[PDB]
């Protein structure tokens, strides 16, 4: 189960989630974490492999994207966001625990309009279908 | 129960540039731990000559590739670089170069000014993010 | 290493300032701050300077009283202090802060400089 | 954010382990910083980030610790462990009083 460290998380130091939550993202393309943990993957791979780099590594990381991140997502993001619709500002992430178990969700990231993170009532619906997509996967 | 986190872009240090605001004209990209650009909204102008020259910069030799291959791909998509500075003005076309602005960001002013800086803890409230690149690019 | 200058004795009411040079690094991209030692009390924060001398911040207890500059030609960084009191009395050190894990630390110190206050 | 360290002083004979401990009124996530002062000498850095290790520094010095509480550890005392050690806080910058160590007898 992939896991994330106290250097990549704000005000949280180990929150983490089973490796079948994370087994979603080479199959769904219209999830807007999982790019993030690409580019995470990329930067351990490039730290660590790569050694001594000469001042940046600006063509690893042109041709990186190309293989690595969702383009459409981004212009997607974009042109909602210059029409002016809740769109996703790649920050703030919002998922489900099941405190009782400890089953988790892939988290969906959070919508943000008019400069200011709305509350979870405004998408309050979106919660409940995910809750009934847990009831799926209850059996 | 429901739980929200928040990413530390700043792991992402090395490896990738970042990016984030700090007032409504001035803007700030970083690459490594020691130089980033100045993208600053001013009404003062800084050179006079009306000629940019590009390939010279890069026959050069003397200069550092990090730095300026941000500033080609936002000219794909007038200058001074005498002494290995770097000093890059857009005066107010606005269209275009408006929209990039605020495509990195995620009138009344008269030039955009892109210039080297060292890293300062400069933008207040909005934390890094590598987003803007990775859609300029 | 940090070699530290300008402390001695003076009056209460009076003025000083403190020199602080810098050789062995690019003194241009570096934090610096300045810290206290009362005599037999800990360590006691005094001021921060950034990089290009933008940032500027201050201990609540001494406020509007040191200035601190820094001249990059000469790396040199200086304290000001005004209106000395009886217990500005301490030996001082100039610190190089760092940026690591986003958090400040002072991984490299200098000597120590004494200042006494007495009529 | 007050800086409260504990305790005032310890007495370690070689060979032993021991533990000092930094609390503050808020939680300041992962921002503390271990540093220690031999008498008249100009103080080293020993910890920052609560967890990290500088280069340069024996293995057995180890720190952990989170949100409003932090400890130090030092498992194999030597005779150039002794010393006064000071917790601080790296976002506001403030020190904290002092801890003393000295050989038992």
């Known amino acids: 189960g992939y896991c994330l460290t106290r250097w990549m998380l704000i005000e949280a130091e180990l929150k983490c989630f089973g490796n079948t939550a994370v087994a979603k993202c080479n199959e769904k393309h219209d999830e807007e974490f999982c790019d993030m943990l690409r580019l995470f993957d990329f930067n351990k791979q490039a730290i660590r492999r790569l050694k001594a780099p000469a001042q940046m590594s600006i063509q690893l990381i042109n041709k990186a994207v190309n293989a690595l991140i969702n383009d459409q997502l981004i212009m997607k993001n974009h042109l909602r966001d210059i029409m002016c619709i809740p769109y996703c500002n790649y920050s703030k992430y919002w998922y489900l625990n099941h405190t009782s178990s400890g089953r988790t969700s892939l988290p969906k990231c959070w919508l943000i309009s008019n400069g200011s993170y709305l509350n979870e009532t405004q998408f309050s619906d979106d919660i409940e279908q995910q809750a009934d997509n847990m009831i799926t996967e209850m059996l | 129960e429901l739980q929200t986190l928040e990413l530390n872009m700043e792991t992402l240090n090395m490896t990738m540039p970042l990016s984030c605001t700090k007032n409504s004209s001035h803007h700030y990209i970083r690459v490594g731990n020691e130089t980033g650009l100045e993208l600053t909204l001013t009404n003062t102008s800084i050179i006079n000559h009306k000629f940019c020259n590009l390939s010279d910069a890069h026959k050069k030799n003397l200069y550092d590739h990090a730095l300026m291959s941000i500033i080609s791909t936002f000219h794909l998509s007038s200058c001074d670089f005498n002494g290995g500075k770097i000093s890059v003005q857009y005066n107010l076309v606005a269209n275009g170069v408006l929209q990039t602005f605020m495509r990195m960001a995620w009138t009344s002013y008269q030039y955009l000014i892109i210039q080297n800086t060292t890293w300062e803890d400069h933008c207040q409230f909005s934390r890094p993010s590598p987003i803007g690149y990775l859609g300029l690019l | 290493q940090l070699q530290e200058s300008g402390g001695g004795l003076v009056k209460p009411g009076g003025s000083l300032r403190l020199s602080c040079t810098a050789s062995?690094?690019?003194?241009?991209?570096?934090?610096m701050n300045w810290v206290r030692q009362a005599p037999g009390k800990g360590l006691e924060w005094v001021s921060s300077i950034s990089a290009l001398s933008t940032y500027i911040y201050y201990a609540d207890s001494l406020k509007g009283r040191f200035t601190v500059s820094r001249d990059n030609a000469k790396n040199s960084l200086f304290l000001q202090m005004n209106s000395l009191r009886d217990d500005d009395t301490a030996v001082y050190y100039c610190?190089?802060?760092?940026?690591?894990?986003?958090?400040?630390?002072?991984?490299?110190w200098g000597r120590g400089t004494l200042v006494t206050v007495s009529s | 954010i007050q800086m409260t360290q504990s305790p005032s002083s310890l007495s370690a004979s070689v060979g032993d382990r021991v533990i000092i401990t930094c609390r503050a009124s808020?939680?300041?996530?992962?921002?503390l910083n271990w540093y220690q002062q031999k008498p008249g000498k100009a103080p080293k850095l020993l910890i920052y980030a609560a967890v990290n290790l500088e280069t340069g520094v024996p293995s057995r010095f180890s720190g952990s610790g989170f949100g409003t509480d932090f400890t130090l550890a030092i498992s194999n005392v030597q005779p150039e462990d002794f010393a006064t050690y000071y917790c601080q806080q790296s976002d506001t910058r403030t020190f904290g009083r002092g801890t003393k160590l000295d050989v038992k007898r």
């Open positions: 062995g690094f690019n003194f241009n991209k570096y934090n």
């Open positions: 610190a190089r802060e760092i940026r690591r894990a986003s958090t400040w630390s002072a991984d490299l």
């Open positions: 808020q939680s300041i996530s992962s921002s």
